[PDB]
Amino acid sequence: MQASQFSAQVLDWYDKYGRKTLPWQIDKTPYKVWLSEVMLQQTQVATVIPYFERFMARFPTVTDLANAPLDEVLHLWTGLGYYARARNLHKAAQQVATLHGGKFPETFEEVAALPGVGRSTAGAILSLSLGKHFPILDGNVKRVLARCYAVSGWPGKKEVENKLWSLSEQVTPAVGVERFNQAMMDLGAMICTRSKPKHSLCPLQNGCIAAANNSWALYPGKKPK
């Protein structure tokens, strides 16, 4: 379907059915969004909430996190798994304190330079917390776009990844970008799921190719072997 229709239908859906009450969505700041994104990378929302609250209480600012001993950070992380995320989290806090005066950077290049932060995550931090014009491409987004536009091939290959980044940019609006990006993650997480996606609850059901062809299993493509 047309790019302008994609954006409008997703935004209208978010307004009435989207999640807007999570802790990291109230009184948003780059620090809070960054922290939530790292915790959410490999952990479900229900498990993350208590940890997010404990971290914000112990570390009100990024400088407080930077000055704390690494052992205390790892102790508070216990139970979230994938500790490389925590080690990079502490190094990034120290980089913000050292190079940016304790104020989380608000430009793409500076954010993407932080340990543990990639292209998609940097775009998420800045679009969600400040409304800057950047698209995202996590597992959730790849699933929705690949199915709606029938993008076959394994995203692990450069040519396929490039096509998906181009599509995301095409459908991502400037006006309301913070609402649109959160909505796309919401959809891929609860509606357009890995298995048995719930088409009847999706705002893209009237134009999605996978839904029309009953071929959601083909997108995104899997690693060939």
> How many CB atoms within 10 Å of residue 141?
24
Site for ligand SF4 contains 114 (CB under 6 A) = no
Kindly name the residue from 37, 109, 110, 169 that is annotated as catalytic. 37
CB of 80 within 8 A of CB of 43? yes
CA distance 183 to 157: 26
Number of helical H runs and strand E runs in the chain: 12, 0
User: Whose Cβ is closer to ligand SF4: residue 142's or residue 147's?
Assistant: 147
Q: Is the link from the previous residue into 69 a cis peptide, with omega within 30 of 0?
A: no
Restricted to residues 129-148, the positions that interact with ligand SF4 (CB under 6 A) are: 144, 147-148
Query: What are 22's two structure tokens?
Result: 């999570």
Q: Which of 129, 171, 130 is nearest to 148 (CA)?
A: 171
Burial 40-53 (b: 16+ CB within 10 A, else e): bbebeeeebeebbe
Judge whether 72 counts as a catalytic residue: no
What is the nearest approach in angstroms of ligand SF4 to the Cβ of residue 106? 32
Question: Taking CB under 6 A as the rule, does residue 205 contact ligand SF4?
Answer: yes
- Using CB under 6 A, count the residues that bind ligand SF4: 14
210 forms part of the interface with ligand SF4 (CB under 6 A): yes
Alpha-carbon 173 to chain mean position: 16
For residues 4 and 59, what is the distance between their CA atoms, to the nearest angstrom?
41
Interaction of residue 191 with ligand SF4, rule CB under 6 A? yes
Reduce the DSSP state of residue 1 to 3 states and report it: coil
Q: Is residue 9 part of the contact set for ligand SF4 (CB under 6 A)?
A: no
Instruction: Please identify which residue in 38, 135, 204, 220 interacts with ligand SF4, judged by CB under 6 A.
Output: 204
Provide, rounded to whole angstroms, the least separation between the CB of residue 59 and ligand SF4: 37
Q: Which stretch binds ligand SF4 (CB under 6 A): 17-25, 27-35, 116-124, 189-197?
A: 189-197
User: Is residue 167 close enough to count as binding ligand SF4 by CB under 6 A?
Assistant: no
User: Which residues form the catalytic set?
Assistant: 37
Footprint on this chain of ligand SF4 (rule: CB under 6 A): 144, 147-148, 191-192, 197, 199, 202, 204-205, 208, 210-211, 216
